[PDB]
Design a protein around this ligand. Sequence first.
Ligand code: CA
Ligand code: CA
Length: 460
Amino acid sequence: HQVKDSLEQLRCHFTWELSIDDDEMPDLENRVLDQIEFLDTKYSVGIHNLLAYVKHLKGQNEEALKSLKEAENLMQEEHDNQANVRSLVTWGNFAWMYYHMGRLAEAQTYLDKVENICKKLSNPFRYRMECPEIDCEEGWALLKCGGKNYERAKACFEKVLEVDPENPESSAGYAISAYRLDGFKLATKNHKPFSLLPLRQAVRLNPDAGYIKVLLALKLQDEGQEAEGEKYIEEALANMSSQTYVFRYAAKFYRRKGSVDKALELLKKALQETPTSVLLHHQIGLCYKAQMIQIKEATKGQPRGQNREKLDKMIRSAIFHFESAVEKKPTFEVAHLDLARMYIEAGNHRKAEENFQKLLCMKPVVEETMQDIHFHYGRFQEFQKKSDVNAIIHYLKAIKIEQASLTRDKSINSLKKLVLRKLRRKALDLESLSLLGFVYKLEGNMNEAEEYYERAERLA
RNA sequence: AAA
Ligand SMILES: [Ca+2]
Ligand SMILES: [Ca+2]
């Protein structure tokens, strides 16, 4: 069992516990291919190694080997024919691949190659290469393989920065990881911009990287500094680096600014290059949603004639793009939620119900998203289905998720409004009395709460 | 990637 024990010491995709879920594999493969073609980075060894690992997980070991060979071929130029320690990731994946294929002599050859380099570099381990380049590669792999891996990704880059605080690559990976983790908490009460200073530093250390500039722009916009952020959007759009990714995030920036036509123009160009992107399809749907809202405002909710035909175009186009996003990534929870909400606007309550039911069964990485699922389903039940029983059930389920948030507060307020309504139709409804006490209790009005709980108990 |  020497071979397997040695393989487990290698630092490569097979030992990084990426935990790629089958339902997310088609989208991951599409995003890996997109990144190969359109992300401008100094080294591309990592992304080709991840494609090889994906092919392996798909049962295509011969195709996986082709991607490992391409990773080696490309490095001959990304370093000018010179030796680079990132090759050890490729060699580790070769050893594992050959082990799985039964080519065990070749597997041992690649173990020996890794060991030889670990010796040459005075590495303490025989097969586990300790160097910042591989810490970065581990981090980038984690950062590509879904939100559940982002704390681990951030820690990879942080490990490098604790010894080399001006390292450009780990500064970038740390900042992007931190930005996405900030995004998970963006609706929680008292959330803070932990990623802003990291993004400033990453832009300083990677002055040509448009990808990072547009994230800095968006975080500045989050923090009420839209004008400063827009300067970074313009700088990123003036350069060709990773242009198609720059378009995605610039479009988000302009949509949130209110320039929805400009956002759509950018997204339509980006979709020509990466038509499978679920982020693009979701962003396009959000643009059509925003334009739907604009039409409702200008017509005070009663569009007619051409305005109605435009509204219907917006609704049906948003549905098309949200459906496209969830076909490609069925675990994309918030796209299902936008989709359910847009079927309400189309008047199709059965399809809205259908998507809400799917959502109630999901297990989002971001647990607070279930607050929004219950809240919007509760509103659907109250207003479209005219079911106070089910509205109360789901407002309460949102409230039971204790994390303080915008939506938890809205769920408390919606429950309060519903109950106050029922009590006007029936002042001695026991259930509504105690629920109103519950609401006051959550608000901190303990005297008003107890009098309503007591009042309810007397009737009983 | 909604918020
Ligand atoms: Ca390019
Ligand atoms: Ca190729």
